[PDB]
Amino acid sequence: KPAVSVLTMFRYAGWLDRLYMLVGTLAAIIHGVALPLMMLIFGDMTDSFASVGQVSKQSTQMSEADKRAMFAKLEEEMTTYAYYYTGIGAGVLIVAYIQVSFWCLAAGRQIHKIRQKFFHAIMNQEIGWFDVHDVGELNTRLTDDVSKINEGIGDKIGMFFQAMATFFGGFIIGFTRGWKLTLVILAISPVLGLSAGIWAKILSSFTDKELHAYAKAGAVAEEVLAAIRTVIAFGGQKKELERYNNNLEEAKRLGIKKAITANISMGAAFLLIYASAALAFWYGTSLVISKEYSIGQVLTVFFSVLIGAFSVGQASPNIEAFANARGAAYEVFKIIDNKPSIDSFSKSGHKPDNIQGNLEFKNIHFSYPSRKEVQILKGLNLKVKSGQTVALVGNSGCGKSTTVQLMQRLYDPLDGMVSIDGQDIRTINVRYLREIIGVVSQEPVLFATTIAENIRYGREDVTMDEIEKAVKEANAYDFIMKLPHQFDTLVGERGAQLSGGQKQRIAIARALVRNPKILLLDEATSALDTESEAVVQAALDKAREGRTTIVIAHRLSTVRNADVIAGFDGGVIVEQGNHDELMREKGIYFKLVMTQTPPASFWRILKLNSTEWPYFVVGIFCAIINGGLQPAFSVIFSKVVGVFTNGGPPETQRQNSNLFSLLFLILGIISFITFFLQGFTFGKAGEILTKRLRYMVFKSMLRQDVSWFDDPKNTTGALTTRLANDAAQVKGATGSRLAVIFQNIANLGTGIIISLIYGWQLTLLLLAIVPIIAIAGVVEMKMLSGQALKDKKELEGSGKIATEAIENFRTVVSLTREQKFETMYAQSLQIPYRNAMKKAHVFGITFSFTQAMMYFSYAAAFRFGAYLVTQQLMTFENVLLVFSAIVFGAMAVGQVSSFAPDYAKATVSASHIIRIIEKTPEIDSYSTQGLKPNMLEGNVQFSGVVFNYPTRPSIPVLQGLSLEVKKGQTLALVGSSGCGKSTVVQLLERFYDPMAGSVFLDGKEIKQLNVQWLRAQLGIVSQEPILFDCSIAENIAYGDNSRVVSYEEIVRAAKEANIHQFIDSLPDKYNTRVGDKGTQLSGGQKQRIAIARALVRQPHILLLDEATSALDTESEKVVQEALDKAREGRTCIVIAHRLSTIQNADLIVVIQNGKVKEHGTHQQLLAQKGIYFSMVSVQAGA
Ligand SMILES: Brc1ccc(Oc2c(Br)cc(Br)cc2Br)c(Br)c1
Ligand SMILES: Brc1ccc(Oc2c(Br)cc(Br)cc2Br)c(Br)c1
Secondary structure (H helix, E strand, O other), X not given: OOOOOHHXXXXXXXXXXXXHHHHHHHHHHHHHHHHHHHHHHHHHHHHHHHHHHHHHHHHOOOOOOOOOHHHHHHHHHHHHHHHHHHXXXXXXXXXXXXXXXXXXXXXXXXXXXXXXXXXXXXXXXXXXXHHOOXXXXXXXXXXXXXXXXXXXXXXXXXXXXXXXXXXXXXXXXXXXXXXXXXXXXXXXXXXXXXXXXXXXXXXXXXXXXXXXXXXXXXXXXXXXXXXXXXXXXXXXXXHHHHHHHHHHHHHHHHHHHHHHHHHHHHHHHHHHHHHHHHHHHHHHHHOOOOOOOOHHHHHHHHHHHHHHHHXXXXXXXXXXXXXXXXXXXXXXXXXXXXXXXXXXXXXXXXXXXXXXXXXXXXXXXXXXXXXXXXXXXXXXXXXXXXXXXXXXXXXXXXXXXXXXXXXXXXXXXXXXXEEEOOEEHHHEOHHHHHHOEEEEOOOOOOOOOOXXXXXXXXXXXXXXXXXXHHHHHOOOHHXXXXXXXXXXXXXXXXXXXXXXXXXXXXXXXXXXXXXXXEEEEEOOXXXXXXXXXXXXXXXXXXXXXXXXXXXXXXXXXXXXXXOEEXXXXXXXXXXXXXXXXXXXXXXXXXXXXXXXXXXXXXXXXXXXXXXXXXXXXXXXXXXXXXXXXXXXXXXXXXXXHHHHHOOXXXXXXXXXXXXXXXXXXXXXXXXXXXXXXHHHHHHHHHHHHHHHHHHHHHHHHOOOOHHHHOOOOOOHHHHHHHHXXXXXXHHHHHOHHHHHHHHHXXXXXXXXXXXXXXXXXXXXXXXXXXHHHHHHHHHHHHHHHHHHHHHHHHHHHHHXXXXXXXXXXXXXXXXXXXXXXXXXXXXXXXXXXXXXXXXXXXXXXXXXXXXXXHHHHHHHHHHOOOOOOOOOOOOHHHHHHHHHHHHHHHHHHOOOOOOHHHHHHHHHHHHHHHHHXXXXXXXXXXXXXXXXXXXXXXXXXXXXXXXXXXXXXXXXXXXXXEEEEOOOOEEEXXXXXXXXXXXXXXXXXXXXXXXXXXXXXXXXXXXXXXXXXXXXXXXXXXXXOOOOOEEHHHHHHOOXXXXXXOHHHHHHHHHHOOOHHHHHHOOOHHHOEEOOOOOOOOHHHHHHHHHHHHHHOOOOEEXXXXXXXXXOHHHHHHHHXXXXXHOOOOEXXXXXXXXXXXXXXXXXXXXXXXXXXXXXXXXXXHHOOOHHHHHHXXXXXX
């Protein structure tokens, strides 16, 4: 929404840049004007053939006499037009170079200036400007927004003025040569703009319906794949597939309905567009029979008008490129034009010599850019004598850290002044002030250069002698010399990461080369290992003694030797004095001392599509007919102009033109009929395999075992996305792109035959010219992408050192050396600059070549179409036919290169989708094999079970676990922590087979038992019961599948679960909808329902996995009261964390490291004193 003045945007263009644009926009207008004139000449060549075409047939008497006057007229005329034609091509060759080269030159020259001024402005902002802004967005604003500015002031402006030249020049020739066709052509424009307007209303409204349609099926997939362990436990995998299959059935009916309507729309709009044109041309014919406009003049206007009419559309993108570059330049120039109060690039203020370093802080009130929300310093008074070292202590707020901030004048205070020596700090030059102040901060930062270079960031003029004395004066010399490469080592986020105490020592040496008169040490010892802390502390003590120093830290070891200590309470300076005096004061300071002491040939996807042997042959045969039918319109056009140029006696002409225009409209309606078929057939054929694919995938997905659904690769969202994308992508490959790719190869094929079977030596020439200009059009795009990738790689190195400069900004400004990063960024940009200079010459040459290759190709089309061909016995009507036929059949092949990624993006989506079906699990619920015992009573035997989870085979959970529980008794399961308690329930459900050992139920190993039948005897109840969106009766009846459960039966379970108070209180009762879609209720009712569906199954084994986990107050007392009634009649395994409710259990087992540690009845493990006795004691006391 915000934008820039047009003149301010070009503020960096002067002298030559203004001229380049002037000559550039000039030649660009010359380039545009060249095309409608080329069409004006195409009319004069027609009249030459038309005057001879009328007189040649007018004879029917003399023959050799027509070998004289006609050929002579053709000789002087065709040579004149071909001479003019060759001139236009040389014109476009020059102006198209001038057009693109000059504009890309001005673009490259200015963007170089923009990028330097921009980065200079970034480093010029004061710190308070950075505290309110995001540096990451700022750096991306540097590389991206400048690119948008470059796209808008580049060769696009030349293309814009080239287009308006065609537009103006087209309608000028349109009006002057005959303004009775222009107004007729404009009259059909609203119809074409209205038909394409129905497309923007149909596409936008129906694209939501499909994203709405599958969102109902993908919702089924979501609540299923999220509750996968519940449907797996209750075996609803046929139902959840059936539901998904039932929603897929509706999505395909809405998909074929959209295929019917969208193809009716496309064919009707195409027929309206072609009938609109054929009327404007048949109207053109009605004005030639009236002897008002020559047969060649109708072409001259009809072409120049339609050329300039579409030149509007070809200019609209360049308008958006310029406007976007304007608005992109707003926030950029806003930074450049913004002037700071602090500067630091300013050359102003005093530079005191013989600085003795007497600092004082006077009544300083301050607040960080958070402003009126917080005021961290309410008044202040602090002096520090020269040579002394004052220490600042404080409980919190870190108002200590603020004084170091103000001392470098990173901010100016709200009220009060900071005084170095006697002068106010704001009277001293900012840079010189930062140069007389050395800074060592808590987190040290080293730029990605050598050690000597990082030390060289203290002062640019320095020799390795000073570097050596500095690092030796910080006792950092000894440890770096052992490091290889000596001072020439590397540092940074990338490469040679060092100890913290060593990086700080380099930072102390960096600040030591500064030879500052003022020293500021902010928590430099804090957040550092204890051993190396003394090593750095020795250097800090050796860094002072020649300077006045303010130091802030939470280490009260470094503070004793300070001449003065200062305490803060709420930004107010409270206590000050020597260490001993503050202890006698027994104030804040004393208080803090005591406190701290694979693309491949996949035909089988087409073999699955072979379910429909028809519907394809219908579409293909219908598409090839539509292919063979398109050039016949060019054939009709060739003979509407052909018989009119070849007319001779004019009486027969007027009756023939009516017959052709009629047949055209009969071919158009027969084109509409065949287009709707090839669309509908492919559409329906695409929508049905969408169901088959999503059905087989969702079926095979419900086949895999819990081992697969635990994969971090496969989450519920990543599966629904893999489910939607892979099915829609393969539809596009076998869909429109194929019907089109066959319609077009038939379009060229039926066009190339007619052209080859007509004009001799004529088609053979055009077949030498057209492929070369097509290839030359391709190679230009390749060099364009290569230059684009190359320039992306080069400015990346610049923005990389810009990223380092601005992300570590607060450090660089503290060391000044901003001019250093300026010079580095400038040297980095110099290569893309000289690169951008060559880009203009290349871009202009390629564009001018492809334009000249199109214009010269046109001269050879007529000079050969006349002369050798028309001096013989070859007619013009065919040359026109071969033109439209070949040129259109080629431009129809241009759609093959556009649908190419639709094929690759589908094969990759097919690659996954063929494997996701074929993958088979270790435990397949679909296998009908298995025992299915007849004996009801259930035992459970865990024997020697070692189990590790397939996702984390690192820490084992079960190591030699052994339980046994008889029928009708409760097996309590206590554990120190982890799924060691829970893994029992998962293995009994046989979510996994154990690594070693085995688990039995009736004495039969479940591993050889039937998987589905095994889980059919289990009454699983988990922590968070997930209930699908349907009737609570269905959530209850979900407990028994393969049979519809009686209402009184699901009532019995709801009576059993004590949930019946709700189920009758509701208005809908058992038919109420739950799942946070129709109604919402608390977890206690959710659990009771899960208990009901558990015992609707009438299991012989309950499995209660921390059922009271998420529950509170009386809700626990009523759900436990329901669970306690559900067991005692069945085999039961309870792992609940309420050991008070486990007291009445037939056997309590303590799990330890996967082994059973203690076991026995409650009082038995209470008689013993150990883990279970400690478990019952800790949470009974707490
Ligand atoms: Br835009 C444009 C349209 C037609 C051009 O040549 C013609 C011309 Br002029 C007339 C017919 Br019919 C077919 C072709 Br191809 C040229 Br060169 C450029
Ligand atoms: Br009659 C008649 C035939 C073709 C005409 O131009 C074309 C041409 Br040339 C090719 C195709 Br495809 C469609 C149309 Br409409 C015109 Br205008 C009038």
